[PDB]
């Protein structure tokens, strides 16, 4: 069976090898290094691929899985908020998906600022938060939506749709059903916003680095990878893209930890099996 224990073992084997090869070394040329001074990485074991880095002062990466273009990042540190907001505005972000739990955000020891559920000022940038709709994803998992309006003197004001799942604890994986529903909501939200920019003739439509959904949890490697994998399988242009391809691409373009837990990988495998999508490359 293409989805049996033999195939699953082989997939794990290949992915394990890749994670080790991608392990970060001292002053690794493959990973973004702190530009001296403030901290760059929220975790010293979760690095940012240099060649695909979005900004020199952020732990965030451009990722393309098959034809699906996104941005994956860590939860921004307090000192990185101004840069985070500027990145969101310049990207003409069609949707920001936050998968960090309200419990993590509320834990002061974790240093995860609640930057999207309240308004505030960050350097020269002012942000307004407004609540919008709420969509149930199943199993009690809720998606709370907001709109973040980013203002800065001399810059165009940009509003960003936010999808926040506050009940998805770290080191865990929600069901394939919930994940599929989440991916559909995130893609739909982005499509509506992207279309608006196209109707206004935005120049971002011609920039491969812009109009990308932005997704993050705490480290930007577990929950974030599970959602990105589900999103690429929701892309009608990715026929024949294998699970091996998906995970190898996320790892090579961010870090070797993408898709951390085995249960998270199982969700991607289950979603693939439902589509008759291959797990391995021949």
């Amino acid at each position: 069976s293409p989805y049996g224990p033999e195939a699953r073992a082989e997939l794990s084997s290949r992915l394990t090898t890749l994670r080790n090869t991608l392990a970060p070394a001292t002053n690794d040329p493959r990973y973004l290094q702190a530009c001296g001074g403030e901290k760059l990485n929220r975790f010293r074991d979760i690095q940012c691929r240099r060649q695909t880095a979005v900004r020199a002062d952020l732990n965030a990466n451009y990722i393309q899985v098959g034809n699906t273009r996104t941005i994956a990042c860590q939860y921004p540190l307090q000192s990185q908020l101004e840069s985070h907001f500027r990145m969101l505005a310049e990207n003409r972000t069609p949707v920001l998906a936050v998968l960090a739990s309200s419990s993590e955000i509320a834990n002061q020891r974790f240093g995860m600022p609640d930057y999207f559920r309240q308004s505030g000022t960050y350097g020269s940038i002012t942000v307004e938060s407004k609540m919008t709709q709420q969509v149930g994803l199943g199993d009690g998992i809720m998606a709370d939506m907001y709109t973040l309006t980013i203002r800065e003197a001399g810059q165009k004001t940009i509003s960003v749709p936010v999808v926040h799942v506050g009940n998805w604890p770290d080191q865990t994986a929600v069901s394939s059903e919930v994940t599929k529903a989440l991916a559909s909501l995130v893609d739909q939200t982005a499509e509506t916003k992207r279309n608006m920019y196209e109707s206004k003739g935005s120049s971002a439509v011609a920039d491969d680095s812009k109009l990308r959904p932005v997704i993050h949890c705490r480290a930007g490697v577990g929950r974030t990878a599970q959602l990105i994998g589900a999103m690429c399988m929701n892309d009608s242009r990715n026929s024949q893209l294998s699970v091996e391809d998906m995970v190898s691409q996320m790892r090579v373009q961010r870090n070797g930890i993408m898709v951390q837990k085995d249960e998270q990988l199982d969700v991607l495998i289950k979603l693939a099996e439902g589509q008759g999508r291959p797990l391995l490359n021949s």
């Binding site: 003409r92 309006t149 165009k156 004001t157 940009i158 509003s159 920019y197 206004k200 935005s202």
Partner: peptide, 6 residues
């Protein structure tokens, strides 16, 4: 305009 994208 500054807020044309709103």
């Amino acid at each position: 305009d500054a807020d044309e994208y709103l």
